[PDB]
């Protein structure tokens with residue numbers, strides 16, 4: 001059983017590491033509004049949108065029972081971006097950088113949580 005405060009304390013630094021990436025985190029910080037962004041087919045392609053602010057809210061409000069659910073949301077965010085965007089795009093390349101950062105951050109943390 002994982003207490004929500006323990007998950008927050010352990011996992012939030014990994015999320016903060018993503019947020020600190022500039023310019024790479026910028027398209028990932030807030031939920032996608034497809035009409036506002038001029039990408040009206042977004043939710044047709046991306047069935048389960050995810051973004052950094054949603055993940056933070058889930059940690060803040062105790063919505064994860066176990067740490068792999070958090071890892072899965074981060075990876076969902078990445079996979080959505082690699083699915084929707086062209087390989088030359090900023091979002092695609094930025095996603096790839098975030099995945100590099102996340103891999104390094106999450107490893108010791110997951111080992112520590114068990």
Ligand SMILES: COc1ccc2c(c1)N(CCCNC(=O)c1cccc3c1N[C@H](C)CC(=O)N3)CCC2
Pocket residue numbers: 023026027028032037039080081084085090091
């Ligand atoms: C589009 O690339 C950039 C790169 C840098 C910056 C911005 C936009 N802008 C705008 C940020 C807001 N737009 C997006 O978030 C976005 C736009 C088009 C497509 C995608 C968008 N992002 C999500 C992940 C959905 C996605 O899969 N693809 C801010 C200044 C910095």
